[PDB]
Amino acid sequence: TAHRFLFVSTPVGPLGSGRGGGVELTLPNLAKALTQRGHQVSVLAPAGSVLPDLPLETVPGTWQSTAQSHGRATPAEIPAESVLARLWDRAHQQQADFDLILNFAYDWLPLYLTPFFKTPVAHLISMGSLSEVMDQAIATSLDRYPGSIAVHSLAQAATFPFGDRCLCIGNALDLAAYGFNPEPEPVLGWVGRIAPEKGLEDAIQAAQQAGLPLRVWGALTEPDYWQRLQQQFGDRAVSYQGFVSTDELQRGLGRCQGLLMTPKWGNVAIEALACGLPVIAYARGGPLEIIEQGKSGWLVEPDQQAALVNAIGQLSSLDRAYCRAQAEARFSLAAMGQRLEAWLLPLLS
Amino acid sequence: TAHRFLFVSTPVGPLGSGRGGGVELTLPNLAKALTQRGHQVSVLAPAGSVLPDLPLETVPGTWQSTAQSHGRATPAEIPAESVLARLWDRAHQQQADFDLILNFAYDWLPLYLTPFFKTPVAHLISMGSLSEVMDQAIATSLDRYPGSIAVHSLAQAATFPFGDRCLCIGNALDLAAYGFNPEPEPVLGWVGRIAPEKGLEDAIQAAQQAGLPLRVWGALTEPDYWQRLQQQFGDRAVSYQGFVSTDELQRGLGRCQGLLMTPKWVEAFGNVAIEALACGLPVIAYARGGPLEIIEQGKSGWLVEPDQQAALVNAIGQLSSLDRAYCRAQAEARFSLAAMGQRLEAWLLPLLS
Numbered sequence: 001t002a003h004r005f006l007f008v009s010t011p012v013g014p015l016g017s018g019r020g021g022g023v024e025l026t027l028p029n030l031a032k033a034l035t036q037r038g039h040q041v042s043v044l045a046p047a048g049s050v051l052p053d054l055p056l057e058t059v060p061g062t063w064q065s066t067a068q069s070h071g072r073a074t075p076a077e078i079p080a081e082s083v084l085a086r087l088w089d090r091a092h093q094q095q096a097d098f099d100l101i102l103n104f105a106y107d108w109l110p111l112y113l114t115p116f117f118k119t120p121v122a123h124l125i126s127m128g129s130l131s132e133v134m135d136q137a138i139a140t141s142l143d144r145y146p147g148s149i150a151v152h153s154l155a156q157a158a159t160f161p162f163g164d165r166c167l168c169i170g171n172a173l174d175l176a177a178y179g180f181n182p183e184p185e186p187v188l189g190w191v192g193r194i195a196p197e198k199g200l201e202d203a204i205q206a207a208q209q210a211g212l213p214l215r216v217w218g219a220l221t222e223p224d225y226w227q228r229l230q231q232q233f234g235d236r237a238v239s240y241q242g243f244v245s246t247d248e249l250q251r252g253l254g255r256c257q258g259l260l261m262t263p264k265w266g267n268v269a270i271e272a273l274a275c276g277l278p279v280i281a282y283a284r285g286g287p288l289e290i291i292e293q294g295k296s297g298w299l300v301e302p303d304q305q306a307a308l309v310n311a312i313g314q315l316s317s318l319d320r321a322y323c324r325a326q327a328e329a330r331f332s333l334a335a336m337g338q339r340l341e342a343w344l345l346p347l348l349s
Numbered sequence: 350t351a352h353r354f355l356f357v358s359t360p361v362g363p364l365g366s367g368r369g370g371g372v373e374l375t376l377p378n379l380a381k382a383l384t385q386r387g388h389q390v391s392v393l394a395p396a397g398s399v400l401p402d403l404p405l406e407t408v409p410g411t412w413q414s415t416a417q418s419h420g421r422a423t424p425a426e427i428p429a430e431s432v433l434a435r436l437w438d439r440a441h442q443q444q445a446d447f448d449l450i451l452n453f454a455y456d457w458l459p460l461y462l463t464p465f466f467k468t469p470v471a472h473l474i475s476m477g478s479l480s481e482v483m484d485q486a487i488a489t490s491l492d493r494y495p496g497s498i499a500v501h502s503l504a505q506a507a508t509f510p511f512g513d514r515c516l517c518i519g520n521a522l523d524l525a526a527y528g529f530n531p532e533p534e535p536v537l538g539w540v541g542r543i544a545p546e547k548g549l550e551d552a553i554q555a556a557q558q559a560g561l562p563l564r565v566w567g568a569l570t571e572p573d574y575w576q577r578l579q580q581q582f583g584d585r586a587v588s589y590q591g592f593v594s595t596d597e598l599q600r601g602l603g604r605c606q607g608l609l610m611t612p613k614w615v616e617a618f619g620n621v622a623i624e625a626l627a628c629g630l631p632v633i634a635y636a637r638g639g640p641l642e643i644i645e646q647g648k649s650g651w652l653v654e655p656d657q658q659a660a661l662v663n664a665i666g667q668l669s670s671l672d673r674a675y676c677r678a679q680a681e682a683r684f685s686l687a688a689m690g691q692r693l694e695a696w697l698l699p700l701l702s
Contacts, residue, residue, distance in 0.1 A: 158596060283568065283592035293589035294575045301568035301592065314572040 002038040003348070006098040007031055008091055009045035010105045010126075011064035011084035016050040018193060018219025018243050019063070023104050023126055025267045026152075028054070029174050030102075030124075033337035042098070044091055046083045059086045064107060068130065076108035076133050088113055095119040100344055106130075111137040114145065120347045124150050125166070128159035128265060128285075135160065142166070150343055152266050155285045167343055171266045171290070172336030173327070177246050178274035180324045181254030187239075188312065189256035189277065191217045191249070191268045194227055194240075199262035199282075204230065206260060206308035208237040215256060219243040250275050258315040260308065261287055269297075273327040276320035280311040296323045351387045352701065355447040355468075356380055357440050358394035359454050359475075360413035360433035365399035370415075371475055372453045374620065375501070377403075378521050379451075379473075382690035391447070393440055395432045408435045413456060417480065425457035425482050437462055444468040448701050455479075460486040463494065469700045474500050474515065477508035484509065491515070499696050502619065502642050516696050520623060520643070521689035526595055527627035529677045530603030536562045537665065538605035538630070540598070540621045541612065543569045543589070548611030548635075548656075553582050555609065555661035564605060568592045603628035607650075607668045609661065610634035619643055622650070626680040629673035633664045643684075649676045 009027055013019025031041040031054055043051055047060035061083030068074050078085055084107055091101055092113070100120045103110040106127045114121045129135055139162050142149050150167045157163030188207045192198050194216065207214035216238060220227055230238065241252055253259070254275030261269060261281035269279045269290045279297035281287035291297035298314060300307035358376055362368030380390040380403055391404035398407050410432030417423040427434055433456055440450055444466055452459040452472045463470045478484055488511050491498055499516045506512030539552045543565055556563040565587055569575060578587055590601050602608065608625040610617075610632060619639015622632045626643070632650035634640035644650035649671065651664035682688065 155597075158594060288591050288593070293569070294572065294579070298572045299569065299589070299592070300572070301570050304570060307570045310570065311572045314576065317576060 002040070003099040003345075004040040004097065005031075005034060005042070005344075006091060006094070006101045007041060007043045008087055008101060008103050008105065008110065009043060009049065011046060011082075011087060011107065012066055013063050014046045014048035014050070014058075015043075015056075017048065019221065021126065021193070022267050025173070026124075026126070026171075027104050028052075029172060029333060030336065030340060032174060033172065033333040033340055036333065037337050037341065044087050046087070057090065059083060059090055061086045064105070072131050074131055074133075076137075078109065084109055092117065099348055102344070106134065108133055108137045111141045114141050114148070120148075122148050122150070122344055122347055124152075124169070125156070126152065128156050138162070145347075147343070148347060153286045153289050155288060169336070169339045169343060170331075171270055172331045172333055173267065173270050173274055174246075174333055175274055175328060175331070178250045178271065178327075179254060180274075180276045180321070182276060182320055184257035184277070184320070185255045186212060187256050188212050188214050189217070189253050189259045189272065190214055190261075191253065191259065191271065192263075193218045194220050195222050196226060197264055199264060201230070202262035202303070202305070202308070203260040204233045204238045206262070206305055206312065208233060209305060209309045210312040212257075212312060214238045214260070215241050215252070217241045217244065217249055217252065253277060258312060262308070266290065270327060270331045273297075273323045274331070276324045278315055278318040278320065278323050280308060280315070292326065295319075296326045351389070352448040352698075353389045353446065354383060354391070354697075355440060355443070355450045356390055356392045357436055357450060357452050357454065357459070358392060358398065360395060360431070360436060360456065361415055362412055363395045363397035363399070363407075364392070364405075366397060368412075371618075371620070374522070375473075375475065375520075376453055378523055378686060379689060379693060381523060382521060382686040382693055385686060386690050386694070393436050395436075406439070408432055408439055410435045413454070421480050423480055423482070425480075425486075427458070433458055441466065449697055451697070455483070457482050457486045460490045463490055463497075469494075470497070471697055471700055472498050473518070474498055474505070477505045487511065494700075496696070497700060502639060504618075504638065504642065518689065518692045518696055519683070520620060521684050521686055522620065522623055522627065524627050524680060524685050527599045527624065527680075528603055529627075529629045529674075531629055531673055533606045533630070533673075534604045536564050536605050538564050538566070538590075538602055538608045538625075539611070540566045540602070540608065540624075541616075543567045543575070544571065545574055546613065547616075548613065549578070549587075550581070551611045551656065551658070551661065552609040553578065553587050555658055555665060557582060557586050558658065558662045559665040561606070561665065562586070562588055563609070564588050564590045564601065566590045566593065566598055566601065599624065599628055602630060605630050607665060608632045609665075610640060611655075611661075612638075614638055614655075623680060623684045626650075626676045626684070629677045631668055631671040631673065631676055633661060633668075645679065647671075649679050 010020045010023045034041050042055040044057050047058045049058050062079045062081045064084050103123045150169045151157045157166045190203045259272035259279045266286045272279050279291050282302035283299040284302045298311035359372035396407045396409045410430045411428045413433050450470045455476050491514050499518045500506045506515045537556045608630050617638025622640050622643040625632045632644050635655040636652035653660040653664050
């Protein structure tokens with residue numbers, strides 16, 4: 001029996017701007033996982049958002065800041081003309097048109113508003129623990145509404161003291177959008193948003209160290225001033241490929257013989273695997289649950305440049321077809337759709 | 350009665366960085382051992398340090414090298430911008446806010462400065478004898494201040510001529526962070542750097558001879574080493590479990606029927622065995638270094654001849670002789686923060702006033 005869901009997106013920026021982080025990939029993929037099982041999914045997101053096949057409603061207003069002004073002590077903030085506030089006002093007005101509302105935003109207000117809704121509200125958490133106000137908002141809604149909080153990885157849940165009461169739904173992609181490439185060029189890839197402390201420096205240095213050009217995909221929003229700054233490695237070393245569509249990304253990415261992930265503190269690793277692309281990552285966080293050591297990638301001692309360069313040297317030992325097979329066996333929409341229902345359908349009753 | 354302590358951390362690297370050596374683990378546990386009795390503990394440590402729930406002040410400067418340029422005759426060295434010198438200058442400024450200052454650094458300077466403080470200074474010596482200058486600084490402090498020097502193990506103490514005048518406070522960890530697992534999977538564990546010259550081959554070959562998969566926890570630096578192990582021992586034989594947090598390590602380690610410890614002697618101290626015991630996991634270790642003072646032969650593990658396959662295999666086959674609940678009971682009785690807090694009070698309280 002089929003149901004009607006409303007997905008409320010992140011307020012940090014529009015779907016398609018590259019500003020929403022992983023939610024920009026997760027939300028449409030989870031929506032498609034559910035509609036392919038006969039459900040209706042509508043999306044509510046900031047003005048300027050795009051979404052190819054689904055009902056979308058947008059609301060103008062000021063985007064939610066990402067800044068941690070006081071570390072773990074920074075309060076929740078609602079600016080004038082807040083888009084987050086307007087999104088949840090709009091959701092509330094139409095709450096009776098849906099069986100369940102799914103919140104994708106890492107913010108205090110949707111959690112606080114949950115008992116103010118008659119329609120059930122579930123929360124897919126996309127970040128690890130960052131602030132006291134957020135930890136407490138999530139815990140409160142866990143206490144009141146068991147099973148209402150999901151996460152993407154065990155590593156992510158482990159950053160929360162209540163992590164064991166969060167349901168882990170893992171990750172998935174629309175694999176039919178991604179082509180397997182068995183014949184890479186002698187280049188490395190990096191995917192992410194192009195901004196300070198995103199690990200991008202570690203990747204360039206390692207790829208350079210290894211004698212391989214680094215190709216870089218993502219959104220440029222310290223532009224070019226953070227970016228051009230980094231031609232302190234030379235266009236010798238690093239090659240911006242743009243912020244592109246998924247189809248452009250997969251055909252470009254699949255040409256790399258490896259993907260470097262060098263973050264600090266999920267989709268991107270799977271996107272590489274889906275193209276046949278092994279992943280070299282710091283042994284830290286979400287990649288530990290995606291990559292199979294020495295089979296679909298290399299998980300290496302974090303912050304060690306010789307480790308990255310050693311791993312780059314062992315890329316051709318990895319079977320690209322295995323990487324693609326792992327993506328199909330583990331990260332399909334069809335299985336994510338099953339996990340979504342096991343999570344959300346009990347929340348209806 | 351409750352007292353106020355200042356802990357001055359190691360200069361070799363920041364707390365919570367991975368680059369501070371063993372003090373990185375001991376200092377937070379010994380601090381917690383005292384604050385769980387109602388004492389106050391504040392910490393001075395290098396810039397970049399991270400230490401939850403305790404007053405922490407950090408100090409900029411160059412880390413202290415651990416390397417000796419010519420062995421036991423190496424002088425004590427103070428580089429420009431020495432973080433060690435700055436730590437002890439700052440501790441001196443604030444000495445009157447505390448009843449006692451506890452030094453964790455293995456260095457000449459804090460011992461030399463002890464008579465220049467009005468507040469008592471105690472010293473936790475975390476390593477064995479390495480230099481004439483350090484031996485003599487410790488011996489002089491013992492002569493002037495009997496009872497002011499502690500060590501973690503009796504082995505360490507005996508590398509010193511005055512070892513019998515040092516107090517041994519043993520080891521502890523935060524057992525509340527470790528879950529007792531009475532029902533393991535039929536697997537073995539091994540914890541350490543996934544790198545050559547770590548005894549990992551010894552552990553793999555013995556687990557394989559015994560018919561048991563080996564799970565490993567630790568950092569991989571050379572991916573070709575991983576392939577070399579696959580080529581030598583087969584594509585199973587060793588299963589990578591992660592480079593993971595303390596809470597993740599204990600959840601996975603607890604699932605093993607035994608922990609194999611095969612380190613070279615210079616790395617055979619000693620705390621991973623306590624983590625295994627705290628999970629109910631008996632320990633099979635080479636019979637040298639720190640494990641000799643952790644494991645009870647034939648009760649909480651097996652202490653075996655080093656570098657001998659047959660001895661590891663024989664021990665793996667007697668894991669069933671060992672009571673996992675007894676392993677946990679020994680951790681609670683011997684290696685708890687509660688036990689450590691009592692030893693610290695017995696050591697430090699007579700030094701007050």
